Design a protein around this ligand. Structure first.
Ligand SMILES: [Zn+2]
Length: 37
RNA sequence: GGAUUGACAGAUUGAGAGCUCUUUCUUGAUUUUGUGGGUGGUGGUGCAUGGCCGUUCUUAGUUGGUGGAGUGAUUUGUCUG
């Protein structure tokens, strides 16, 4: 189980997340969502 | 098991440029590219045009209808004062 959830304002907890090592970050929250959940 | 944008911060780069990376998701086919066509084009010729303007040019000039002169190009009318 990998690649956990965002705080995406568009839909409530409903995306997978494009993440490097040691972070957690959405694929459309490109200008927002600094803290990795 | 996404044609492709773009992804915090760290050397960048006008900065939150994923421009390039240290690298993985979404609205989902509307285009990564294979011809053939305008293209942004102000880099294209006003020597192919319009339209406009300037000029010839604050000067007095121009033409056709009848008839005359000349075979005719053309003159006359449009003039000596
Ligand atoms: Zn979403």
């Amino acid at each position: 189980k990998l690649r956990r959830e965002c705080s995406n304002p568009t839909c409530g907890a409903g995306v997978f997340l494009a993440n490097h090592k040691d972070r957690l970050y959405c694929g459309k929250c490109h200008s927002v969502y600094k803290v990795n959940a």
